Amino acid sequence: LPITLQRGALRLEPLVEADIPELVSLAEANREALQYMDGPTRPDWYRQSLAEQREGRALPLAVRLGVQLVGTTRFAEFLPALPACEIGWTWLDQAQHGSGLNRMIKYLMLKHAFDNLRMVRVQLSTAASNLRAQGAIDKLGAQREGVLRNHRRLAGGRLDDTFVYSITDHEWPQVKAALEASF
Amino acid sequence: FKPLPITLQRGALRLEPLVEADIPELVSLAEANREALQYMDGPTRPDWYRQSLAEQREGRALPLAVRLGVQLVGTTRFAEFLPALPACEIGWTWLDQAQHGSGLNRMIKYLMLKHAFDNLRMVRVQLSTAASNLRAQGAIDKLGAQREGVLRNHRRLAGGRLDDTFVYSITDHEWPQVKAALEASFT
Numbered sequence: 001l002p003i004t005l006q007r008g009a010l011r012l013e014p015l016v017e018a019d020i021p022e023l024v025s026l027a028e029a030n031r032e033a034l035q036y037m038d039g040p041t042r043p044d045w046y047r048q049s050l051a052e053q054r055e056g057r058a059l060p061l062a063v064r065l066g067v068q069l070v071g072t073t074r075f076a077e078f079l080p081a082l083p084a085c086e087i088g089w090t091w092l093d094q095a096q097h098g099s100g101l102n103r104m105i106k107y108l109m110l111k112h113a114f115d116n117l118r119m120v121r122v123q124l125s126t127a128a129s130n131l132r133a134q135g136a137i138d139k140l141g142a143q144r145e146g147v148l149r150n151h152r153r154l155a156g157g158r159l160d161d162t163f164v165y166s167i168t169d170h171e172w173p174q175v176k177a178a179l180e181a182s183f
Numbered sequence: 184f185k186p187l188p189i190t191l192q193r194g195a196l197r198l199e200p201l202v203e204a205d206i207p208e209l210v211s212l213a214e215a216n217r218e219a220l221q222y223m224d225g226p227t228r229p230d231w232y233r234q235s236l237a238e239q240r241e242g243r244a245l246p247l248a249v250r251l252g253v254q255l256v257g258t259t260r261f262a263e264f265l266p267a268l269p270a271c272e273i274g275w276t277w278l279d280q281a282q283h284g285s286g287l288n289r290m291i292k293y294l295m296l297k298h299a300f301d302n303l304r305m306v307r308v309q310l311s312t313a314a315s316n317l318r319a320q321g322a323i324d325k326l327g328a329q330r331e332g333v334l335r336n337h338r339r340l341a342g343g344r345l346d347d348t349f350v351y352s353i354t355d356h357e358w359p360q361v362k363a364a365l366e367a368s369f370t
């Protein structure tokens with residue numbers, strides 16, 4: 001079920017059709033930053049996430065900081081029987097990199113997955129080539145679970161492997177603690 | 184990317200698209216094999232089968248009935264399509280116990296892999312099973328798939344226990360050697 005997540009001027013709100021033109025314009029200005037992701041520069045990647053939201057299979061979000069739309073992120077790949085999900089499909093306008101915005105977003109999202117939704121597992125994933133997102137996943141305290149070969153494309157169409165990580169419900173108290181103490 | 188509902192065949196073996204008509208018969212057979220199926224979540228209830236047909240109605244699965252001449256002997260599936268690649272998983276396989284150790288599992292994956300790589304032009308086929316499911320890990324190892332990771336709290340077993348998942352793959356580059364080995368094991 002759709003949620004708005006907020007801390008002060010930071011709002012994560014369900015993605016809507018009206019957000020798409022601006023996200024595509026914002027992604028063009030960040031074209032090079034988005035090089036390890038396939039889709040975010042095209043409307044179909046956003047429309048796909050809203051299709052899935054309708055089918056109860058994703059919760060995509062618009063990231064707003066004050067008045068300004070600064071990116072997007074998503075819960076998806078639900079495993080209802082566990083429950084489990086993945087958090088990802090995140091990009092942020094590059095003025096926000098290094099700011100702590102990503103850590104805060106991930107803290108609000110994990111806190112929802114574990115404290116409210118009762119997830120037993122949360123997966124995070126990124127391209128083998130994406131050294132920045134890897135560092136950022138590390139900093140969360142997610143543990144690497146695997147390397148999936150020939151599992152993705154980069155923005156220019158090149159094939160890449162995926163690094164897969166997770167946080168389990170047992171690890172979450174210490175993950176929560178560690179993040180909160182970095183604020 | 185549009186995988187269509189194909190029949191695969193080798194001699195008296197056919198893999199034919201699963202239909203609703205198959206499900207009563209599959210459910211009774213799985214019940215007969217209840218304990219062999221204990222590492223899988225759901226194959227003894229009709230809903231597991233309709234869920235696959237529903238996914239198929241969406242272009243998200245290709246569920247299959249396994250037949251030896253006219254005998255129904257189990258089920259298997261292509262699913263988790265990654266259209267941009269293209270890639271999929273081959274899985275959700277169970278055979279009747281009389282066929283355990285007959286080489287039927289291997290011939291089934293051989294037909295499926297040939298179709299994935301040779302017809303659908305996939306760059307990756309994934310296989311996965313419970314961390315507890317040693318026999319399946321053996322058959323996967325035997326196919327020539329390389330283990331890629333262990334995913335924690337990633338599944339439930341037949342009685343609802345949480346288990347991890349071992350994840351494997353065969354890439355398009357490994358396929359020829361895998362094919363060669365499979366072909367040699369049959370012949």
Ligand SMILES: CC(C)(COP(=O)(O)OP(=O)(O)OC[C@H]1O[C@@H](n2cnc3c(N)ncnc32)[C@H](O)[C@@H]1OP(=O)(O)O)[C@@H](O)C(=O)NCCC(=O)NCCS
Binds near residue numbers: 089126
């Ligand atoms: C992935 C993303 C959301 C992470 O947010 P971020 O604010 O940049 O992340 P952080 O700065 O908090 O963490 C990145 C860490 O990796 C390290 N790092 C940054 N660039 C690096 C590089 N090229 N090589 C190795 N390490 C690098 C940094 O040192 C930093 O850690 P530090 O604080 O100890 O120095 C963001 O960078 C982004 O939107 N990228 C563009 C789109 C994308 O690739 N999406 C991610 C796919 S999941």
Ligand SMILES: CC(C)(COP(=O)(O)OP(=O)(O)OC[C@H]1O[C@@H](n2cnc3c(N)ncnc32)[C@H](O)[C@@H]1OP(=O)(O)O)[C@@H](O)C(=O)NCCC(=O)NCCS
Binds near residue numbers: 279284285318321
């Ligand atoms: C999984 C299944 C389809 C495999 O077919 P199979 O005929 O049983 O497999 P094979 O005999 O070809 O391979 C089993 C391999 O596991 C290993 N092995 C055999 N028995 C084992 C055991 N009980 N414990 C650990 N390893 C074992 C060996 O490598 C063996 O190969 P071998 O012929 O060299 O001895 C079948 O067991 C089945 O339908 N099981 C129930 C459903 C299920 O668990 N689904 C699998 C989901 S991926």
